[PDB]
Design an enzyme around this catalytic site. Structure first.
Site, PDB file in Angstrom:
ATOM      1  N   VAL B 115       0.933  -1.103   0.000  1.00  0.00           N
ATOM      2  CA  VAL B 115       0.000   0.000   0.000  1.00  0.00           C
ATOM      3  C   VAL B 115       0.988   1.169   0.000  1.00  0.00           C
ATOM      4  O   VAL B 115       2.114   1.057   0.524  1.00  0.00           O
ATOM      5  CB  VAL B 115      -1.046   0.115   1.232  1.00  0.00           C
ATOM      6  CG1 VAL B 115      -1.573  -1.269   1.534  1.00  0.00           C
ATOM      7  CG2 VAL B 115      -0.490   0.805   2.418  1.00  0.00           C
ATOM      8  N   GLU B 116       0.611   2.269  -0.660  1.00  0.00           N
ATOM      9  CA  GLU B 116       1.471   3.437  -0.837  1.00  0.00           C
ATOM     10  C   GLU B 116       0.656   4.640  -0.416  1.00  0.00           C
ATOM     11  O   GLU B 116      -0.573   4.691  -0.572  1.00  0.00           O
ATOM     12  CB  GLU B 116       1.888   3.653  -2.308  1.00  0.00           C
ATOM     13  CG  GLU B 116       2.588   2.412  -2.867  1.00  0.00           C
ATOM     14  CD  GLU B 116       2.956   2.418  -4.332  1.00  0.00           C
ATOM     15  OE1 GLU B 116       2.276   3.069  -5.120  1.00  0.00           O
ATOM     16  OE2 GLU B 116       3.928   1.739  -4.678  1.00  0.00           O
ATOM     17  N   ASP B 117       1.346   5.644   0.072  1.00  0.00           N
ATOM     18  CA  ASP B 117       0.664   6.809   0.535  1.00  0.00           C
ATOM     19  C   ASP B 117       1.546   8.001   0.194  1.00  0.00           C
ATOM     20  O   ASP B 117       2.750   7.825  -0.021  1.00  0.00           O
ATOM     21  CB  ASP B 117       0.446   6.634   2.042  1.00  0.00           C
ATOM     22  CG  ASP B 117      -0.549   7.582   2.678  1.00  0.00           C
ATOM     23  OD1 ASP B 117      -1.226   8.314   1.956  1.00  0.00           O
ATOM     24  OD2 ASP B 117      -0.657   7.569   3.906  1.00  0.00           O
TER      25      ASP B 117
END
Lengths: 81, 229, 229, 81, 81, 229
Positions: B115-117
């Site tokens: 997951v990337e933010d």
């Protein structure tokens, strides 16, 4: 690893070999050997002084982040989400 | 995002970093099935990719000029005004990005996931951004456990890491997060041959990053914490 | 974006337009290594792609219906109100797009590069949009020079071209900039054979666009500056 | 070209052949011969009269731009940035 | 189908076979047999309770739409437009 | 988006749904050539994809974990605030998505086309959203006919379908519209072999969805209007 023997029975393999000297290549580019892929992690930031054009400011600061630390300059980035 | 049944991850599955086995978890997260999920700092893994690809001054097995590399990626842009106390809502003082990889306990049926933010920071104080960023690790661990529940996937560990930059008055910052998906060239494989495809992947899987650096005759670009993101 | 070690460009590298050879630079830019980068107008290159693909009414070797064509692409939309003097945020009088190709001096090491741009025009006067567009070439040329320095790539020439439209009241305009990456069919190759794929690329390198038009029996769609963008 | 001789020594080739009658295909589609690609330049603008719906207005004005001058209508476009 | 007789005369085929046990795979992935593709329709909606992070809220509600009804969970989505 | 000369659609060209032949048009749209284009609800096609992929709880021939699946896709996100009467720019009560596939009359020359649409609903009343949604079906059909004219492509029919959710206070909704492009595994093909690829696609063409479920020993997940979107 023992994993590849379970995977192989399902028709899957993890082979990802590039036919070129020195350079890695992307998953799905024609001419690679195997049907697997290898990945890794890059988070980096880059800046550019603000100009009159947001799109060009966007392009250059991106290009500096790509070129910072692990080099992935001059690649055509496709997005998977 | 995902790296599944076809993948391996640099610094963990091939060319493993020693600092991975020596790492201690920062905290744990509970998953839908009641197991604890340990969350680690991803810096060994970020560093490992700099060892393989090289830097712009010391290029190693970087992607070919003009190749198409599919990447799981996100990014954010923000301007720091050149002479304004009022930030208008797209603006800010700093910019940051994050990447998390979570390895599936059972890789023959569940995929591992990224997951990337990314986001903007609105305070001139870097210590406050670092405090905020440790809080984004908890927020990302929370979203990994929810995405896991949705697919009933259980994970063995998550490695979360960050990058950032504080910009000066009148600069635009771009913070990017990317997981490249690539092919390995034969010359990066000690003893590999184009004729032994399967054996080439075993070699890379059997070498740790120190060993590979030795066999190739490359110095360590990451050694005494030289790399900062 | 980039066209690198694997690419050729229509109208330059294969089927080169004689207008590329007769063209004079509009101005030059200094690169990081001190050389001058001549900037030209990209119209001979734009025109060459419509000779090859054909137009909707005179279709030639265009992409197959339903094919997946990866493109370095960017685009912008804006709306002109039906009867409002005040223009809000996503609104304007015209819409413009741009593409620049910069050829690498050493194509075995450096990739050639695309820079794309697009924006909204906020006055109803077309001569003012055309003066602003001449200012965007300089803007794009400074971008090229900075990206070049990032990877230490030196370039031989840049070819920058524009498209635009002025909206009537109550119209939405879309200006797109696209560089497709394609495969050529055997029948577009005078003398080609599926059995000789190496020779087939050579045949197209050696034909000039007039010579290919003539061997294919095609009229020139560009001819006397017939195409407007 | 002489470039191709230097390139082929690195494992790289610029061959890009479509197996179809008349039509070009995109890089990485299955069945193309060779491991290179060819590119080109298209900048165009299209319009539609404004409706109640922005997404649909953007789709039709886009299609109008794809269809004007060098024909690239009815393709699935993926983005490289 | 009779249509295929016509299409093959143009060099086109619609064969799209995955070499894996159970699982479909995407068009252009290495190892598929044939140069065609198969498609279908999925429209779905997911939700998540709001948090301080918009990007993460976008990620989990997207994941929930992917995993609801026709399962397309855990894939890397590439966009065609 | 487009499905062209390379494609087939689950529920229509392969594993054809019975409900496709019993379906009656909701209305017709006139096309550039004068023919009438009948518009149908796409529910049989949408249902046919969950019969093939299965659901998260009853997984059938869904995409490999971690595979890369190119999709004609769009989406929309909107927040409904926890306790606020005033709704700002990215806020709403509900969120909807739509897909329309319209089949080419001559599939050797023209592609079949996808148009997708998505949006935010601004009143709390679901019955007002559903009347709106029948208006979107007419809006989409207008879009279809203009895209057909641009390329002088005639369609034989369009199938439009919708998905939506109404959010509770403090929730984020995400409505997505996706058409995946995939390849089919041998074990989903009764009587298929890896050695008979053309025959494999002919088997799937001749099977209707009930017959395939019978051959496979699968319960129908669609049966008595069970699936809701």
């Amino acid at each position: 690893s023992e994993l590849d023997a379970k995977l192989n029975k399902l028709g899957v393999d993890r082979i990802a070999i590039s036919p070129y000297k020195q350079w890695t290549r992307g998953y799905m580019e024609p001419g690679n050997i195997g049907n697997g892929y290898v990945t890794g992690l890059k988070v980096d930031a880059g800046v550019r002084d603000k100009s009159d054009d947001d799109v060009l400011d966007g392009i250059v600061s991106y290009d500096r982040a790509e070129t910072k630390n692990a080099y992935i300059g001059q690649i055509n980035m496709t997005t998977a989400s | 995002x995902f790296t599944g049944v076809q993948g391996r991850v640099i610094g963990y599955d091939i060319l493993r970093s020693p600092e991975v086995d020596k790492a201690k978890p920062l905290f744990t997260e509970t998953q839908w099935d009641g197991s604890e999920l340990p969350i680690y700092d991803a810096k060994p893994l970020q560093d490992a990719l700099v060892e393989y690809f090289g830097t712009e001054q010391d290029r190693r097995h970087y992607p070919a000029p003009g190749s198409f590399i599919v990447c799981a990626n996100k990014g954010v842009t923000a301007e720091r005004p050149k002479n304004d106390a009022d930030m208008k809502p797209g603006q800010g003082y700093g910019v940051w990005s994050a990447i998390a990889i979570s390895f599936a306990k059972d890789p023959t049926k569940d995929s591992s996931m990224f997951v990337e933010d990314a986001g903007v920071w609105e305070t001139p104080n870097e210590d406050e951004l670092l405090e905020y960023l440790e809080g984004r690790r908890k927020a990302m661990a929370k979203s990994i456990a929810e995405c896991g529940q949705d697919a009933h996937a259980s994970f063995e560990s998550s490695w979360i890491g960050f990058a950032y930059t504080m910009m000066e008055p009148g600069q635009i910052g771009n913070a990017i997060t990317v997981a490249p998906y690539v092919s390995l060239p034969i010359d990066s494989i000690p003893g590999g041959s184009i004729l032994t495809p399967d054996k080439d992947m075993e070699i890379m899987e059997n070498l740790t990053m120190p060993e590979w650096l030795e066999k190739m005759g490359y110095k360590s670009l990451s050694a005494n914490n030289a790399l900062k993101y």
